């Protein structure tokens, strides 16, 4: 199964996502990026049913990009998260619901605060210091419930995330072929190569 | 519940010669263990030197053949009486079949005729419209009995030149219409013996530059 983790530190949001795409007993890719840049300071990671995941993320990306061009303004993460939740909340009672679970990591330039949102395919939304989707949820959560500190720095956050991935590799039965890590801060969205 | 599909049995065989093609089928129509008709044609002249058979569910086969016959009529109307080439007919039939992709035609479709170079051609389709051009094809209930024979006797498969000990394959050669008809008769005679749904009669349509001619041979009625 797919690993997507989010940790919100003092001044940034870090998203770790598994790089493997598997359908049954076949591994289709070992370099997959399960992330879409919604806006310059907002990043969305997604896990779920094949096709639905990318289609939903690209659909959300297009709508947020349209808003940005039309108003020459960046929607706040709180606003972007609410839009995404509502699209999912529509889809559950639709003919064929989108089976996608997302993490939204954004930096709010107005409040100068990083924000992390966890949304499931039903349109269930919460704001959290740290979040995750799937089987990797029960482990990471308890681990982070012990190590996470509200005033942690980005470097401290990466080390804790590094620990979570290492422990997940040992404890998880499926091979998720490593993770891709992306940081969201005031300066924007960057990818951490060394991990 | 109501089941919209049925099986009317029968077997169709298409062989392509150098300057001719044959499409043959048994004239027997069955349901379950009863015989519906000992003579009910399944190989039709569709015009423009094209012969077509849709074998499986008889209702779906009759409907498809009608739609293609209609399709040929409207080709002439919309394209200044252009002759419909076998490759164009094949592509048209794919679109007919794929139209009912989510409520398929339960039939095996073979069409025979001459290609634009005047060489013999056979086209074979699956129920949902997948098609391919072939030298040989058998369709229907007794397809599994006949196709191996045709592989051996038409394409000379697993046959080598005596004294080479499998070093050199038997040379491929174009069969005459007379040789091809013998293989068709032998294939149906054999299939009739071992398949309960095959028998009563055999109708062969031969396609040449001169046109479409029809040969009929009796089969065992048990």
């Amino acid at each position: 199964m797919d690993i997507i983790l989010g940790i919100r530190v003092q001044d940034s949001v870090i998203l770790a996502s598994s790089k493997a795409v598997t359908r049954g007993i076949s591994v289709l890719k070992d370099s997959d990026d399960k992330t879409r840049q919604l806006s310059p300071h907002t990043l969305m990671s997604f896990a779920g049913e094949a096709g639905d995941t990318v289609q939903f993320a690209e659909y959300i990306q297009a709508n947020i990009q349209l808003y940005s061009i039309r108003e020459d303004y960046e929607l706040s993460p709180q606003a972007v998260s609410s839009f995404v939740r509502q699209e999912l909340a529509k889809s559950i009672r639709s003919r064929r619901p989108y089976q996608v679970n997302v993490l939204i990591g954004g930096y709010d330039k107005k409040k100068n605060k990083p924000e992390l949102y966890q949304i499931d395919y039903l349109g269930t939304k919460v704001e959290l210091p740290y979040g995750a989707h799937g089987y990797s949820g029960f482990y990471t959560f308890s681990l982070l419930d012990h190590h996470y500190r509200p005033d942690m720095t980005t470097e401290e956050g990466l080390d804790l995330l590094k620990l979570c991935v290492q422990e997940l590799e040992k404890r998880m039965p499926m091979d998720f072929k490593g993770v891709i890590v992306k940081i969201v801060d005031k300066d924007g969205i960057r990818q951490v190569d060394d991990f | 519940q109501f089941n919209p599909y049925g099986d009317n049995g029968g077997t169709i065989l298409g062989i392509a010669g150098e300057d001719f093609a044959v499409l043959a089928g048994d004239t027997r129509n069955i349901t379950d263990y009863s015989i519906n008709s000992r003579y009910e044609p399944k190989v039709f002249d569709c015009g423009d030197n094209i012969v077509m058979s849709a074998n499986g569910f008889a209702a779906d086969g009759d409907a498809l053949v009608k739609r293609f016959k209609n399709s040929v009529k409207w080709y002439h109307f919309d394209h200044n009486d252009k002759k419909l080439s076998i490759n164009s007919a094949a592509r048209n039939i794919q679109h007919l079949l794929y139209g009912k992709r989510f409520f398929p035609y339960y039939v095996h479709t073979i069409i025979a005729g001459l290609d634009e170079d005047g060489k013999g051609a056979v086209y074979s389709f699956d129920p949902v419209g997948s098609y391919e051009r072939e030298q040989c094809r058998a369709g229907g209930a007794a397809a599994s009995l006949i196709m191996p024979f045709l592989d051996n006797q038409v394409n000379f498969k697993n046959q080598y030149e005596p004294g080479t000990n499998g070093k050199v394959k038997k040379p491929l050669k174009y069969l005459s219409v007379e040789e091809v008809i013998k293989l068709v008769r032998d294939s149906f005679t054999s299939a009739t013996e071992r398949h309960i749904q095959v028998g009563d009669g055999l109708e062969i349509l031969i396609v040449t530059k001169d046109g479409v001619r029809k040969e009929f041979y009796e089969l065992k009625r048990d």
């Binding site: 108003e71 303004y73 929607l75 709180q78 606003a79 609410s82 839009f83 | -």
Partner: protein, 244 residues
């Protein structure tokens, strides 16, 4: 058939004007004057009720000043009924935005939508345009205090101070003369009333012929209050500014 009786409400004149839009603007020029003034610390909306009676219940009456949400109000000039159709549409858009994004709608986005509806009635459908001009007074946390106007054409523009309805030419000259950028709300209240008092076709400006509203950060700390003035409160501000 039916072609015989069609006015064709969405065609250009040989001069490239829209007949029905131009005629609708003529209608609005006869409506009671509405003024909006934007200050550093708030916005004022002042408007004149059209020739009233002594038997009109004023305290339960509303024809000029309407609330769109807690942050945005409009002053109306034209057909009141036509305005109420558009006001209810705007109130719904504001609540649609809040439901989708969980943020109060920015003033311009609401203005642009109402303006785009008006535009549609001029380009398709073969129906008459809305005989309405709006002054939008609003606050958001992007551009702060904002004044806009829209007219039947669906065109909209931003303003420091503006007038719609009757005697706008005269009103706009008086505002352009006395308005300064460093101006405060108390000053803007005085300017608005002094402008109506000079432009009015009535003999004198009294409480029973006015609707008045302020949008102030004069709300305890970091928030915005809308005040639709009561008859007695309009009477008091008329004495304070020294008009009665």
């Amino acid at each position: 058939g039916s072609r015989r009786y069609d006015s064709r409400t969405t065609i250009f004149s040989p001069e490239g004007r829209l007949y029905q839009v131009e005629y609708a603007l003529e209608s609005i020029s006869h409506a009671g004057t509405a003024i909006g003034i934007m200050a550093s610390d708030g916005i004022v909306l002042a408007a004149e009720r059209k020739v009233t009676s002594t038997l009109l219940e004023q305290d339960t009456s509303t024809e000029k000043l309407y609330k769109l949400n807690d942050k945005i109000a409009v002053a109306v000039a034209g057909l009141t009924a036509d305005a109420e159709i558009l006001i209810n549409t705007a109130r719904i858009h504001a609540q649609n935005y809040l439901k989708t994004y969980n943020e109060d709608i920015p003033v311009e986005i609401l203005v642009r939508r109402l303006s785009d509806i008006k535009q549609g009635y001029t380009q398709h459908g073969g129906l008459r345009p809305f005989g309405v001009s709006f002054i939008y007074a609003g606050y958001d946390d992007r551009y702060g205090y904002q004044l806009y106007t829209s007219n039947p054409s669906g065109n909209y523009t931003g303003w420091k101070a503006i007038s719609v309805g009757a005697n706008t030419s005269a009103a706009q000259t008086l505002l352009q003369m006395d308005y300064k950028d460093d101006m405060k709300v108390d000053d803007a209240i005085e300017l608005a009333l002094k402008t109506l008092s000079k432009t009015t076709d009535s003999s004198a400006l009294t409480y029973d012929r006015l609707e008045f509203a302020t949008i102030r950060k004069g709300a305890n700390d970091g928030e915005v209050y809308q005040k639709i003035f009561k008859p007695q409160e309009i009477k008091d501000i008329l004495v304070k500014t020294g008009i009665t």
